[PDB]
Amino acid sequence: NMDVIGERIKRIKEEHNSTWHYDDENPYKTWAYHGSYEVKMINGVVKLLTKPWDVVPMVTQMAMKEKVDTRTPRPLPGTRKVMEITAEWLWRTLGRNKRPRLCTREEFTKKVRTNDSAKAAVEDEEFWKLVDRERELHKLGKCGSCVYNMSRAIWYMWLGVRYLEFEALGFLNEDHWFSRENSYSGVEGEGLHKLGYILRDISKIPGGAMYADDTAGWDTRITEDDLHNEEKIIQQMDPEHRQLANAIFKLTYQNKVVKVQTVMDIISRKDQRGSGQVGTYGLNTFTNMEAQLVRQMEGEGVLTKADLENPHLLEKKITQWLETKGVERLKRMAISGDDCVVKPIDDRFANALLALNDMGKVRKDIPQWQPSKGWHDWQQVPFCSHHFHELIMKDGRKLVVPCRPQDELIGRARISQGAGWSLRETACLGKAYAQMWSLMYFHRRDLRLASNAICSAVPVHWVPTSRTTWSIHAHHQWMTTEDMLTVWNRVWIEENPWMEDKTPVTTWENVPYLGKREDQWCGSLIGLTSRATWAQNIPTAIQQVRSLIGNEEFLDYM
Ligand SMILES: COc1ccc(CC(=O)O)cc1-c1cccs1
Ligand SMILES: [Zn+2]
Ligand SMILES: [Zn+2]
C-alpha cells in the first residue's frame, strides 16, 4: 500500500491544505479513499444541411462510476498457470523480430506538434526538467507525481507522467508490435477501410462460425494477474529500459492514484486498467489475445474444469498446443483492444466458458453460461462499431466497405466539440465530416448527398481542421483540400492491397452505393418523401449557408 503511493498522496494534499479534508460521505466501496479538496454544442452548418434529421431520436440524443467500483474474483490457480504459460509464449512470439527500446523526448515532441496546450509545454525546458526529476525518482523505485484523471501548471505533472510512460512503453505503438504482420491477430495501423477486408480473409479459414463477444467494461476486468502477465515484456528489454518500465508497471499500473470530479476526490487501487495511459491499447490487445487463445484451448478440449482448479497443472500440453498451433489460432482472430472477432476450428468454442468467466472477462448482457451466438456471414460480424459489406462496382471489381447505422454518423457530424468557435471553424469541421463520409461512407445515398451539399456550401479552399474522430482506426485522409475522388482512388484502388486491378475511377458515378434494400436496412431515409423534399430543396439551403459565410469562392458538387 502506502510505501508506493504515499509520496504522491502526501504531495497533493500538502499543496491543497487550502481546502483539504476527509469525508464520510465518499461513495468508495472497493477503491481506497484518502481525501478530497474543493475545486470547481450543435454544428449549425451540418444541421441546416440535414433538416430531415432534426426529428430523428438518435440524432436528438447525441446532441444531449457505478460500473467502475467493483472487484473481480481472483482467477483459479490452474487458470493462473495457463495464463502465465500463454503470456510468456505470446511475448516471445511478439518479440521474435523486434527488440523493445525506449522512446525519446524528440519522438514525443514531434507527436505533440502534429496532433491542445501541450505544445506550449513541450517547448518549455522546465517541463523536461521536471520529467528528468521524476525519472530519477522512478529509477530509485519511487514516484512523486504520476496520477490519473477520470493554466495551473498542475498540467505539467500529468503530461510528464504520460511522457515517462510513453518513454518506457511507447515502443509497442511506435514500432507496431500489434500490426497484423507482427501480431497475427492485431490490426493496429490498418485503418477502418482495411478491417472489413481482414474479416473477409478470416472467413476463408475453415472452422466454425465467427464470434464477436464484447466484454462488460473490459478495463475494470483487468486483474492483478493480468498486470503481472503484461509485465513479462520487461524480460526482453536492455537493463536501463527494464528499470524505467519496471517503474511504470509497479508504481503506475499495479498501484494507481486517481482524481474524480463540487469537490475532487483522490483515490487508489492495485488492479483494473487506468483511464488514459499510453500503454492501454497495446496491453488490452495483448491480454485479449491471451484470453481468446485460452478460450480456444478450452474449445478444443485442451483445458478442462479440473485443469483450471489444479494448482499443480503440468505445462507440457499447453506448451505443445501453443508451439504447434498457437500461431495458426492467432490467425483466426482480429483483436483491437477489447474488440475481438474469433473464428475457432469448430463451434465447441460457443460453450467454452469456464476459463473466460474465470479470468474475469464476463460477456455483457448475456447470462454467464448461455452459449455465445456466432455468425455464419462475415458481413454480419460487428467489430469496432462497424459491420462491413461487399460491393460490386459497375466495372465488376469488388470493394469491402465499412458501415454503421446512419443516424450515428449524422448525429456525430451535427455536434461541434467546444463552444465559442466561429462560423469558419464550424464550416471547416463540417467539411471534415463531409469528406470523411466521401472516403468511408460514400456508399450511403444520403451521406453522399449531404457530403456534396456541405462541400458545395463551404469555401473550396478552406481546409478542414480538428478531428472528426479519435478512433485509432482513423487515418484522417479526409483532412485536405485535395480532390476527394483522387483521395478516394488512392485509398480504395492505388494503395488497396485487396484491389488487384489498379485501373483508376474517373467519376463518382462509378463509385458504387449499397443496394437500396441494404441502404434502407442500415438507416437510409431514401424512399421517404421528406427525404425527396430535402433533396429537391438542398440548393436553396446551400445558397443560404453561402450567403452567411460571405463572398468567398465556392464550387457546386451536385
Ligand atoms: C473504427 O473506426 C471508428 C470507430 C468509431 C467511430 C466513432 C468515433 O469514435 O467518433 C469512428 C470511427 C472511424 C471513422 C473513420 C475512420 S475510423
Ligand atoms: Zn512517477
Ligand atoms: Zn450497413
Side-chain angles (χ1 to χ4, degrees), residues 1-2 4-6 8-9 11-17 19-23 26-28 30-38 42-64 66 68-109 111-115 117-118 120-128 130-141 143-147 149-151 153-160 162-260 262-315 317-319 321-372 374-508 510-515 517-558:
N1 255 273
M2 283 311 300
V4 181
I5 61 191
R8 253 168 306 188
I9 294 169
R11 276 198 195 189
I12 177 140
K13 84 190 215 69
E14 114 148 23
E15 151 162 292
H16 279 104
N17 248 14
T19 56
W20 166 276
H21 49 279
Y22 203 71
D23 186 4
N26 78 93
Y28 303 113
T30 85
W31 293 71
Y33 174 80
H34 301 282
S36 267
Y37 65 81
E38 294 131 18
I42 308 161
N43 176 313
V45 169
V46 185
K47 172 164 169 37
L48 268 78
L49 300 179
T50 53
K51 181 140 158 221
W53 287 271
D54 286 350
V55 155
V56 177
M58 175 80 247
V59 165
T60 303
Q61 176 84 29
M62 280 167 100
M64 86 155 255
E66 11 108 77
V68 174
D69 200 0
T70 62
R71 291 182 183 174
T72 294
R74 219 215 163 169
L76 286 173
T79 311
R80 284 180 351 243
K81 185 121 76 141
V82 174
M83 279 191 294
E84 250 198 320
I85 317 308
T86 304
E88 302 261 17
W89 176 92
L90 201 42
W91 274 130
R92 288 193 310 261
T93 295
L94 287 165
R96 75 196 180 281
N97 299 324
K98 321 180 175 268
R99 296 201 67 229
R101 44 107 182 177
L102 303 144
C103 288
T104 66
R105 170 178 158 166
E106 299 88 347
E107 267 175 316
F108 178 100
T109 294
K111 256 186 143 72
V112 168
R113 297 182 166 157
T114 38
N115 268 55
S117 136
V122 284
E123 261 89 32
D124 170 359
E125 269 306 291
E126 194 65 51
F127 175 61
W128 300 105
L130 295 137
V131 156
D132 283 30
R133 222 170 289 117
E134 188 64 26
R135 188 199 286 109
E136 294 318 287
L137 286 172
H138 280 188
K139 284 188 112 73
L140 292 168
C143 180
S145 61
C146 298
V147 304
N149 289 347
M150 271 168 189
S151 194
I154 178 61
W155 159 264
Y156 269 38
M157 276 135 285
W158 181 84
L159 203 85
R162 304 314 136 220
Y163 165 74
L164 284 200
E165 187 200 340
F166 170 83
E167 155 168 280
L169 295 172
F171 74 91
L172 293 164
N173 323 112
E174 296 316 297
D175 298 335
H176 318 296
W177 280 56
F178 294 99
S179 83
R180 198 150 184 89
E181 178 276 341
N182 196 62
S183 60
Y184 300 116
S185 310
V187 297
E188 178 263 299
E190 305 283 324
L192 175 69
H193 59 286
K194 301 185 168 179
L195 306 182
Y197 284 113
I198 289 179
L199 294 207
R200 184 175 71 176
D201 285 353
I202 289 177
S203 87
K204 297 166 172 161
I205 308 183
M210 298 175 59
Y211 299 86
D213 294 337
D214 67 6
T215 297
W218 171 276
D219 279 357
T220 79
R221 315 302 296 179
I222 288 292
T223 65
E224 279 197 83
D225 291 299
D226 296 328
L227 295 176
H228 188 256
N229 289 330
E230 289 156 3
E231 148 190 87
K232 303 195 196 311
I233 185 48
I234 70 176
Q235 293 161 19
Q236 278 170 65
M237 311 178 157
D238 299 326
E240 52 287 11
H241 195 191
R242 185 159 180 170
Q243 196 161 58
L244 299 161
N246 194 71
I248 291 303
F249 277 117
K250 294 297 194 17
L251 321 162
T252 280
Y253 294 176
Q254 298 164 13
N255 284 274
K256 48 202 141 316
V257 181
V258 198
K259 330 178 143 141
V260 201
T262 292
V263 162
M264 186 102 51
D265 300 281
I266 65 97
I267 288 133
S268 94
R269 83 185 278 148
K270 315 264 188 252
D271 69 3
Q272 313 207 333
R273 169 95 74 222
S275 48
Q277 309 166 347
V278 79
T280 284
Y281 172 91
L283 301 171
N284 285 343
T285 306
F286 177 87
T287 299
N288 206 358
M289 293 175 58
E290 186 191 293
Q292 303 311 319
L293 272 184
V294 171
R295 185 181 178 178
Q296 284 197 68
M297 277 182 239
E298 185 180 335
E300 301 174 32
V302 174
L303 283 184
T304 74
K305 200 156 173 339
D307 289 330
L308 311 176
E309 288 149 348
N310 183 10
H312 314 279
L313 172 78
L314 294 325
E315 292 169 28
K317 80 189 171 149
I318 305 295
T319 288
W321 192 87
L322 285 169
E323 259 141 25
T324 70
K325 301 152 209 83
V327 162
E328 202 269 4
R329 299 302 193 268
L330 290 184
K331 291 185 187 183
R332 301 164 168 272
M333 302 199 294
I335 287 172
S336 162
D338 65 332
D339 283 290
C340 54
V341 178
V342 183
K343 190 179 216 263
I345 64 150
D346 59 65
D347 288 311
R348 285 174 293 178
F349 182 96
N351 206 32
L353 297 164
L354 301 167
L356 183 76
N357 288 321
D358 196 61
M359 298 180 292
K361 304 306 180 269
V362 170
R363 308 159 298 161
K364 84 173 296 214
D365 291 348
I366 184 138
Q368 270 200 26
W369 301 110
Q370 201 173 292
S372 294
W375 288 271
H376 284 282
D377 190 350
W378 64 269
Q379 299 165 93
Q380 306 294 310
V381 175
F383 180 64
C384 313
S385 323
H386 291 80
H387 59 269
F388 305 82
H389 296 275
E390 204 174 75
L391 300 201
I392 288 171
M393 288 166 69
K394 280 196 281 162
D395 51 53
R397 306 181 273 178
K398 296 171 162 179
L399 295 177
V400 171
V401 294
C403 191
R404 73 195 284 193
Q406 190 179 268
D407 312 330
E408 307 167 359
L409 298 163
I410 281 173
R412 182 63 47 189
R414 286 177 56 126
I415 294 151
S416 190
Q417 232 66 58
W421 295 104
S422 83
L423 186 44
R424 186 226 183 80
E425 326 187 280
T426 290
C428 283
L429 182 48
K431 200 184 169 165
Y433 278 104
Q435 300 199 136
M436 171 178 92
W437 294 350
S438 284
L439 258 302
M440 302 304 326
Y441 306 113
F442 56 85
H443 49 87
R444 312 301 310 276
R445 264 150 202 100
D446 304 334
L447 307 185
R448 206 194 294 193
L449 204 157
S451 176
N452 287 336
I454 279 150
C455 294
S456 293
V458 316
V460 66
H461 68 98
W462 286 6
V463 156
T465 36
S466 50
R467 54 223 299 123
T468 55
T469 170
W470 291 86
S471 165
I472 63 130
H473 309 286
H475 297 359
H476 308 271
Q477 311 96 312
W478 46 94
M479 311 296 288
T480 176
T481 55
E482 186 168 18
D483 192 62
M484 279 296 103
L485 183 58
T486 312
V487 186
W488 193 95
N489 261 283
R490 200 175 299 125
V491 159
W492 290 97
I493 310 294
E494 229 163 289
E495 296 165 354
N496 187 339
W498 296 273
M499 181 66 84
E500 230 151 56
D501 174 13
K502 294 322 201 181
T503 296
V505 165
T506 51
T507 170
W508 281 113
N510 290 298
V511 179
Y513 294 105
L514 276 197
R517 215 180 34 177
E518 307 82 304
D519 203 350
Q520 279 162 2
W521 290 332
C522 304
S524 187
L525 308 183
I526 190 90
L528 299 184
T529 73
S530 97
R531 190 256 191 220
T533 281
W534 173 66
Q536 289 176 25
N537 307 353
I538 216 74
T540 306
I542 289 177
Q543 106 177 34
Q544 277 161 233
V545 162
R546 275 163 162 162
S547 85
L548 279 314
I549 276 183
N551 160 37
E552 314 257 353
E553 81 161 299
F554 302 96
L555 286 193
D556 174 61
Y557 287 106
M558 310 318 250

